[PDB]
C-alpha cells in the first residue's frame, strides 16, 4: 500500500493498512459463526433425501413460505410511520455493501 493517500481505492484495497484486503471486493465473507452443512464442509441441508438436520426433517423453503409467509393482499397494513422510500433506501444501501455471485 502507498504510505500516504487522499482517496479510497475503487476495490477497497488498502483501507486497512495491516490487512489490506479487508472490506475489499472479490473476497470471501467473514464468518461470525462456523458453517453448518449436511456433510460438514459443502453440501447444504435439504440436498440428500432422508438426511435430517439436528434430529428433524429439513423443511422445504417453499412449504415454510406457503404456511407462514403467505397472506391475503387485501389485509396489507400500510406503515403510518414509514414511506416506501424507507424500503427503497434499504435495497440501494444493500447494493453498496454486498453481491453474492452465482454462475450465469
Amino acid at each position: 500500500c502507498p504510505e500516504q493517500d487522499k482517496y479510497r481505492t475503487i476495490t477497497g484495497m488498502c483501507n486497512n493498512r495491516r490487512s489490506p484486503t479487508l472490506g475489499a471486493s472479490n473476497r470471501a465473507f467473514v464468518r461470525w459463526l462456523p458453517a453448518e452443512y449436511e456433510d460438514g464442509f459443502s453440501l447444504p441441508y435439504g440436498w440428500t433425501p432422508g438426511v435430517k438436520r439436528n434430529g428433524f426433517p429439513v423443511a422445504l423453503a417453499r412449504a415454510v413460505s406457503n404456511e407462514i409467509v403467505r397472506f391475503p393482499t387485501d389485509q396489507l397494513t400500510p406503515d403510518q410511520e414509514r414511506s416506501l422510500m424507507f424500503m427503497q433506501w434499504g435495497q440501494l444501501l444493500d447494493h453498496d455493501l454486498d453481491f453474492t455471485p452465482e454462475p450465469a
Binding site: 476495490t11 471486493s25 458453517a35 423443511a59 415454510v64 422510500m85 447494493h95
Partner: protein, 464 residues
C-alpha cells in the same frame, strides 16, 4: 442450466415443491436456484464460503463500481470534467439517465419485447431490478455530475481525475450521512441504536470491516417492506394516468418504463408519498414477490421469501437459536418459550409444525417473525445482526466522513446540512418534497414542503 431444469446437480440446488402447493401443481417442477460461487472451488479441505463481489464500505460503490475496469467504463473520458458517463440515446426531460449496458442475456429486453430498451449500466449489476431502484441510481449519477460541475467553477485548475475523486468523496459521505443519521435509527429503534451504534469516537484499524455471511441474509428483512405495486405520481402528487399502480411482477427489470413512461420524477414522488408495507406476524411478505417474482423473465414466478431460506442453507448458515446465542439473547426450546419470545403462540405453533425444533428455524424466517422493536422495524435478533455490521462498517472505515483528516472541520459542518429531499430538489424537476425525516414522512400534502425552504450544500470550504 438452473433456470430451465429441475435436476439437482452442480451448480443447481432447486427448491423442491411441497404437496398441495397453491401455485405449482406438479411436484416434479421446482423453483430455479443456482448455488452461490465458492471462494475455493472443488476443495476437499475448505468449509465452503461465499464471495462478496463489492466493497463492504459505505462508499457509494453502487454508483462508482467495485472493480477498476468497470469504474473506468462508468466515467466520461471524452473531457476533463470528471463526470460519470450518461445515456447517449435518451434523456429524462433533458436530464441524465444511466447509460445502457451490453448484456449477453439481457432480461430487460424481455419485459417489453417491442420497446427494445436494455438494462442500465451502473456501479452494481442490479440497478434495473426495479424502476424505483433505477431512479435512486439515476439521482446519484446526476448528483456526482452536479458536484463535479460546481467543483470545477470553484477550482478551475483541478483536472478530471481530481474533480471525479472530490465529487465521489462527497457522494460517499452523503450516502454515509443519510444511512446513519436518517435510515438506521428508524430500522433499529432508539434502544438497539444506543446499544449497537454508540457515538462514533474515531477510526479503529482493529475493527474487521468485512460483511459477515449472515448479514447477506439478515438484511433481506426489507423484503417484508415491499408494497405489491409501483406507484407513480404527477406534479400535483396525484395518480399519474393511465397506470398509477402497476403490479410489481410487471416492473422487474422493466428499464423501458423509466425510458418511455415519464422518467424518474413520477417514481420518486410515488416513493415519497406512499407508505411502506408494515411487517406483521400474519402479514410477512406479498404474493408479488412470493408467487410472481421475475414472472416476465423466468420460466415461472419465483418465491423471494423461499429463495432467502434456501440461500441461508446454500451458505451453511446456523439456525435461529445459534444466532440468538451469538447475540446473547435467550434460546427458546419449547413451543411455549417461542410463544413468549414472539409474543405470539399461534405463530410459534406454525414455526414448530414447519421446523420441528427452534434450532432449525432459518435466520431470515426467525428474524422477520420477531415482534418489532419500539420505533424500529426489526426484532431483537435482526437489530443485533444489523447494528453489529453497521458499527463495524463505520468504526473500521479509514475513509469514514467523520474520521480525522478525511474532511476539514468546515467541510464536515457543510456536509451535516445535506439530506435526501435536497438531493431530489437539485437533480429532478420535483419542487415539493418530504419533510425530514424522508423515511418517516409519507402523506401529501401534510408531510411535504417546497424545495425553496431547504438550504443547498455550501461548497465554499472545497475552494483550494
Amino acid at each position: 442450466n438452473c433456470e430451465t431444469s429441475c435436476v439437482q446437480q452442480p451448480p443447481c440446488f432447486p427448491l423442491k415443491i411441497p404437496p398441495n402447493d397453491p401455485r405449482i401443481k406438479n411436484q416434479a417442477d421446482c423453483i430455479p436456484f443456482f448455488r452461490s460461487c465458492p471462494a475455493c472451488p472443488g476443495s476437499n479441505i475448505t468449509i465452503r464460503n461465499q464471495i462478496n463481489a463489492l466493497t463492504s464500505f459505505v462508499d457509494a460503490s453502487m454508483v462508482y463500481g467495485s472493480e477498476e475496469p468497470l469504474a473506468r467504463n462508468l466515467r466520461n473520458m471524452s473531457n476533463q470534467l470528471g463526470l460519470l458517463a450518461v445515456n447517449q440515446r435518451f434523456q429524462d426531460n433533458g436530464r441524465a439517465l444511466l447509460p445502457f449496458d451490453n448484456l449477453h442475456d439481457d432480461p430487460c429486453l424481455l419485459t417489453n419485447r417491442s420497446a427494445r430498451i436494455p438494462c442500465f449500466l451502473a456501479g452494481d449489476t442490479r440497478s434495473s431490478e426495479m424502476p424505483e431502484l433505477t431512479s435512486m441510481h439515476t439521482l446519484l449519477l446526476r448528483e456526482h455530475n452536479r458536484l463535479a460541475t460546481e467543483l470545477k467553477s470553484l477550482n478551475p485548475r483541478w483536472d478530471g481525475e481530481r474533480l471525479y475523486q472530490e465529487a465521489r468523496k462527497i457522494v460517499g459521505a452523503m450516502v454515509q450521512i443519510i444511512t446513519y443519521r436518517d435510515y438506521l435509527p428508524l430500522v433499529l429503534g432508539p434502544t438497539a441504536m444506543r446499544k449497537y451504534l454508540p457515538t462514533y469516537r474515531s477510526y479503529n484499524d482493529s475493527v474487521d470491516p468485512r460483511i459477515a455471511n449472515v448479514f447477506t441474509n439478515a438484511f433481506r428483512y426489507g423484503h417484508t417492506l415491499i408494497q405489491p405495486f409501483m406507484f407513480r405520481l404527477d406534479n400535483r402528487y396525484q395518480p399519474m394516468e393511465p397506470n398509477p399502480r402497476v403490479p410489481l411482477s410487471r416492473v422487474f427489470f422493466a428499464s423501458w418504463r423509466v425510458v418511455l413512461e415519464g422518467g424518474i420524477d413520477p417514481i420518486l414522488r410515488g416513493l415519497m408519498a406512499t407508505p411502506a408495507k408494515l411487517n406483521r406476524q400474519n402479514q410477512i411478505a406479498v404474493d408479488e414477490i412470493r408467487e410472481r417474482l421475475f414472472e416476465q423473465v423466468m420460466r415461472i414466478g419465483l418465491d423471494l421469501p423461499a429463495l432467502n431460506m434456501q440461500r441461508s442453507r446454500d451458505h451453511g448458515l446456523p439456525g435461529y437459536n445459534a444466532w440468538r446465542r451469538f447475540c446473547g439473547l435467550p434460546q427458546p426450546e419449547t413451543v411455549g418459550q417461542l410463544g413468549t419470545v414472539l409474543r405470539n403462540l399461534k405463530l410459534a405453533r406454525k414455526l414448530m409444525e414447519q421446523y420441528g425444533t427452534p434450532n432449525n428455524i432459518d435466520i431470515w424466517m426467525g428474524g422477520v417473525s420477531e415482534p418489532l422493536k419500539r420505533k424500529g422495524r426489526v426484532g431483537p435478533l435482526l437489530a443485533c445482526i444489523i447494528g453489529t455490521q453497521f458499527r463495524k462498517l463505520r468504526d473500521g472505515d479509514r475513509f469514514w466522513w467523520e474520521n480525522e483528516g478525511v474532511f476539514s472541520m468546515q467541510q464536515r459542518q457543510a456536509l451535516a446540512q445535506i439530506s435526501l429531499p435536497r438531493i431530489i430538489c437539485d437533480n429532478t424537476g420535483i419542487t415539493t418534497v418530504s419533510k425530514n425525516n424522508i423515511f418517516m414522512s409519507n402523506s401529501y400534502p401534510r408531510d411535504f414542503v417546497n424545495c425553496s425552504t431547504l438550504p443547498a450544500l455550501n461548497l465554499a470550504s472545497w475552494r483550494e
